[PDB]
Structure formats: C-alpha cells, structure tokens
Amino acid sequence: KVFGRCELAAAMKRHGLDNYRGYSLGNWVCAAKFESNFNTQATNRNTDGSTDYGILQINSRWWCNDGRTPGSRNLCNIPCSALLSSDITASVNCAKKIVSDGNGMNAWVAWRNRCKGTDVQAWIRGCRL
C-alpha cells in the first residue's frame, strides 16, 4: 500500500510515534517519504547482501529475518516480510527499538541527509490529527 502524507501521519500518531524519543511526527513522515516513498512493499538490496524492507526501509542484517542474509541478528524478532504489510504495526514497533538503540534517527541515512535540520513540520502541515 501507498500512503498519503496525512493518512500516514495519523497512522503513525495512533501508533505512538509522535514525539517518540524526542522525534516529532514530521521527522518520521519525512523519513518515510525518502526511504520508501510511502510505499509499504518497498525493498532494496544492499551491496553487503542485506536488504531493506518497508515504509521505513528496515535492514535484514540486524533487525529482522529474511532467510538469505548470513550472520544476521533478528533484533525485532519478526520475519522481514512482516514489514511489507499495509498494517504498519510491525514496522512501527521495530522502529522504536532501532531509534532507542543509540544513534537516534541517524540510523536512517535518508533522514540524516534529507530531513535532519529541515523544517520537518511542513510534512504534517494541514492534516486533521
């Protein structure tokens, strides 16, 4: 499923991502925009052989299990395909584990490079929330 900007902000808000670990809702919505382009079925294979999954492009090496990434941990204890659901619940739960880890949202490159320091609130401008 491809989300609307505001449809997503709302879903993320009810799922408790708004202001989670200090990161206001705009940050999350933007990260979503540039990681996956609001598309839940997005996948990207990396050079190290791992693959990134879903709305927030979560990586097979540390966080889930796709059965083809050697030496992986599965720190969110899910199959990696569960992150491609139109229900964003698993993506969201696993995002909270990642963000709480140590590097905050810097764990996401697209955020770090395309959102960090920007007026991220533009991303929730004019949504019923």
Amino acid at 53: Y
What's the domain range around 56?
1-129
Q: Considering its fold, how many domains does the chain have in total?
A: 1
Annotated resolution, angstroms: 2.8
Contact residues for 109 (Cβ-Cβ < 8 A; gap 6+): none
Is 119 annotated in a binding site? The answer is no
What gap in Å lies between CA 71 and CA 116, rounded to an integer? 31
Instruction: List, as one string, the DSSP characters of the chain.
Output: -BPPHHHHHHHHHHTT-TTBTTB-HHHHHHHHHHHTTTBTT-EEE-TTS-EEETTTTEETTTT-B-SSSTT---TT-SBGGGGGSSS-HHHHHHHHHHHTTTTGGGGSHHHHHHTTTS-GGGGTTT---
Residue 1 · residue 97 · CB < 8 Å: no
Question: Domain with 34 in it: what CATH number?
Answer: 1.10.530.10
Long-range contacts formed by 107-112: CB under 8 A, 24+ apart: 108/31, 108/35, 108/56, 108/57, 110/31, 110/34, 110/35, 110/57, 111/27, 111/30, 111/31, 111/34, 111/35
| Residues acting as catalytic residues | 35, 52
